[PDB]
Amino acid sequence: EAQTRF
Amino acid sequence: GPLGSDYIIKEKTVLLQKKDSEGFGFVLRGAKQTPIEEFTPTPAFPALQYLESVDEGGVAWRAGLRMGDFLIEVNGQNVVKVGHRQVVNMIRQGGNTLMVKVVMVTRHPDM
C-alpha cells in the first residue's frame, strides 16, 4: 500500500 | 449474531471546499490491485482506499470524514476497485473542491 496526504 | 457477523454501515457524501494554502486534512491509504483477480467488496473490506488519518478540525474533519472511512466515489467516479495513484489523480483533478462518498463500517461485537 501507498499513502498520500491531501 | 449466532449465524454470523452483524455490521452497522453508514454512508457519508460530503463536498469539501478548501482554501489554496491548506490541505483537505486527510491521508489516503490503499493498494496501488492486481489485474489477475477482481476485488470483491465485503462489509469488512468495502473498498481499496481508506482514510488512514483525518486532521482533527481540518476541512475533511469539519465535513464529517473520519479515520477508517473507506472511499467509494470521488467526484462522481467509483473508486471501490481503483488503485492508489489513479485515485490520487482523481482527487487532485478538482483543485480546491472535492466531493467524496465514503462508508464507515462498524462490526457490532456479540460479546
Author numbering:
A (entry chain C): 2 to 7
B (entry chain A): 651 to 682, 684 to 762
What are the paper's exact sentences on this?
As a β-strand mediated PPI, the GKAP/SHANK1 interface relies on both side-chain contacts and an extensive hydrogen bond network that plays an active role in molecular recognition (H-bonds are shown as orange dashed lines); these features are not readily reproduced by typical (often hydrophobic) small molecule scaffolds.
Thus, for query generation, the key hot residues of GKAP together with backbone heteroatoms were used. However, when our workflow was implemented with a query bearing these features, we identified only flexible peptide-based inhibitor candidates (not shown). We reasoned that the C-terminal leucine, with more side-chain degrees of freedom, might have contributed to the moderate results in our in silico structure similarity analyses. Gratifyingly, preparation of the Ac-Glu-Ala-Gln-Thr-Arg-Phe-CO2H peptide and assessment by isothermal titration calorimetry confirmed the Phe variant peptide to be tolerated (Kd = 5 (±0.5) μM compared with Kd = 2 (±0.3) μM for the GKAP sequence) and to act as an effective inhibitor. Compound Z-1 had an IC50 ∼ 300 μM in a fluorescence anisotropy competition assay.
